[PDB]
Amino acid sequence: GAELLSQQWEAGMSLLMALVVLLIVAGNVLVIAAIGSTQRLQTLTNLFITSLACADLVVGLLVVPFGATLVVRGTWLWGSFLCELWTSLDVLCVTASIETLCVIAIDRYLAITSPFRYQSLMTRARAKVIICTVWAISALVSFLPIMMHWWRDEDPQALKCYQDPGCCDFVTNRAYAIASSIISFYIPLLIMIFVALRVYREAKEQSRVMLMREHKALKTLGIIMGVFTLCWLPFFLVNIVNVFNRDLVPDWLFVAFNWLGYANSAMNPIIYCRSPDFRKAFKRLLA
Ligand SMILES: CC(C)CCC[C@@H](C)[C@H]1CC[C@H]2[C@@H]3CC=C4C[C@@H](OC(=O)CCC(=O)O)CC[C@]4(C)[C@H]3CC[C@]12C
Ligand SMILES: CC(C)CCC[C@@H](C)[C@H]1CC[C@H]2[C@@H]3CC=C4C[C@@H](OC(=O)CCC(=O)O)CC[C@]4(C)[C@H]3CC[C@]12C
Ligand SMILES: c1cc(N2CCNCC2)c2cc[nH]c2c1
Ligand code: NA
């Protein structure tokens, strides 16, 4: 009964998790292979898209598999070091993602308001430095506090979990909860929204065919930004609400919002099918 039920559950979740992993990895490798093999998709903006696809790829190859083994098997099987490395990679990927989205918004703002200054200022070498900087800053605010144990609580519940090698709950003190949320998420969220609204306004104040084609690409970028926020904002809101009251949102919806967050990593490849050029590159590559 209990043994038959767990065998049905384990088998069915293991399949669902495989499918998620496959969709994230196939979809983002396509985005990277498309850009890497299509001279027409090799715009500076798409270098940032590639960076974003790497963040999602790392979620597919490392973050989600590990998290699946946890959801499926009902414990952490890989020891305390890997538990921390895994959390680190989790925080890294969300941080790098939202920071990259921020850079993309800024890139477009400059492109739209000062096309000429942009032309000369913005080159491939600089696009690469920009990308490395975002990963540097993300690595900095992700790994270091986590390997320093700045996130740990002394709660009775927190201390239980820390000793137990089967527990890889990211149970953190309130300071870290607020600090890391603000630094990894909310600040770059606010920047991205502010700059995105400015790019909207500038698009509205803006031959005719070329403008509708540009605008369609902008709206694509708008969509990946909006979906990212929808996918992660709930998690991070619940993260703050927990600091003030552990009992206002049930654990299950906190775990739900966590997976909704991971689910975002499978979405961009699909959204990029709004572009003829991406669509054609995807069809050619799947051969
Ligand atoms: C285990 C964790 C820490 C993974 C860390 C991975 C990063 C080091 C990856 C993520 C995004 C990658 C970047 C994504 C995009 C580019 C653009 C790329 O420009 C190109 O020359 C190729 C495209 C072209 O110009 O045709 C140079 C590599 C670079 C900076 C990559 C360098 C390595 C990065 C930062
Ligand atoms: C590094 C740059 C980009 C960010 C600059 C923002 C900081 C100057 C400020 C803005 C809000 C401040 C935070 C506001 C609230 C908190 C929660 C605060 O309260 C507690 O956690 C004590 C509660 C408890 O331990 O029970 C800990 C400091 C912290 C993170 C503050 C740290 C300093 C912050 C991040
Ligand atoms: C970035 C990503 C975070 N995560 C998002 C996905 N689940 C793991 C944790 C947290 C959690 C607390 N602070 C965070 C900062
Ligand atoms: Na533990």
| Domain range annotation of the chain | 1-287
Rounded CA-CA distance 118/98 in Å is 22
Two tokens, residue 226: 């909006």
Cβ 54 under 6 angstroms from ligand 1: yes
CA torsion, points 23, 50, 182, 217, in degrees to nearest 10? -90
Report the b/e string of 237-251 with b at 16+ CB within 10 A: ebbeebeeeeeebee
Q: What is the resolution of this structure in A?
A: 2.8
Cβ 193 under 6 angstroms from ligand 2: no
Distance 51 CA to ligand 1 centre (A): 6
Rounded CA-CA distance 51/41 in Å is 14
CATH architecture for segment(s) 1-287: Up-down Bundle (1.20)
Q: Please check whether residue 275 is in contact with residue 212, taking contact to mean a CB–CB distance below 8 angstroms.
A: no
The pick from 153, 155, 178, 245 for probing ligand 2's pocket by mutation, whose C-beta has the most ligand atoms within 8 angstroms, reads 178
Residue 22's CB is within 10 A of a number of other CB atoms, namely 12
For tokens 């990211």, name the residue. Answer: 170
Rounded CA-CA distance 104/48 in Å is 7
Residue 235: CB partners within 8 Å, gap ≥ 6?
A: 254, 257, 258, 260, 261
Summary count for the chain: helices (H), strands (E): 13, 0
Q: Is 124 left (phi over 0), alpha (psi -120 to 50) or beta?
A: alpha
Query: Of all protein residues, whose CA lies closest to atom 32 belonging to ligand 2?
Result: 179
- The vertex-95 CA angle with 53 and 240, nearest 5°, equals 135
Kindly state the helix (H) or strand (E) to which residue 31 belongs, with its residue range: helix 2-36
Two tokens, residue 209: 């065919």
Rounded CA-CA distance 221/158 in Å is 40
Q: What share of the chain is helix, strand, coil (3-state, %, to 5)?
A: 85, 0, 15
- Please report the atom of ligand 2 found closest to the CA of residue 176: 30
Is 180 labelled a binding residue? yes
Kindly state the helix (H) or strand (E) to which residue 64 belongs, with its residue range: helix 64-73
Q: N- to C-terminal Cα distance for the chain?
A: 47
Q: How many CA atoms lie within 13 A of 91 on its CB side?
A: 27
Rounded CA-CA distance 218/104 in Å is 10
Cα torsion angle, 169, 170, 175, 177, sign: negative
